[PDB]
């Protein structure tokens, strides 16, 4: 039962260089840079889907 991908989920294809290493308010969180927009995301929550 391959659950199909939802509605708004956008397809950032995992490359290797959009998972860098910024500083989100006092640590060196691993951070994701969404590719359809530019935004950071320095912690895995409320990302972009």
């Amino acid at each position: 039962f391959v659950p199909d991908v939802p509605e708004g989920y956008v397809a950032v294809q995992y490359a290797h260089r959009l998972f860098s290493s910024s500083l989100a308010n006092k640590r060196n969180r691993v951070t994701y840079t969404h590719p359809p927009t530019g935004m950071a995301y320095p912690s895995p929550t409320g990302r972009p889907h």
Binding site: S20, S21, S22, L23, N28
Partner: protein, 49 residues
């Protein structure tokens, strides 16, 4: 002097795309060009012909 050297400072900051002092390797350091029918060791041609 810094004469014999290739790379410097392999690291990434919290925020910047490179720590401003880093030297990438040499494009000529990675390059295997073949050897000819005379022992040569050519580089890989900037080509086309």
């Amino acid at each position: 002097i810094s004469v014999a050297r290739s790379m410097r400072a392999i690291v990434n900051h919290n925020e910047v795309d490179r720590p401003r002092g880093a030297v990438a390797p040499s494009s000529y350091e990675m390059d295997t060009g073949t050897l000819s029918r005379n022992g040569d060791l050519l580089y890989s041609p900037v080509a086309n012909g």
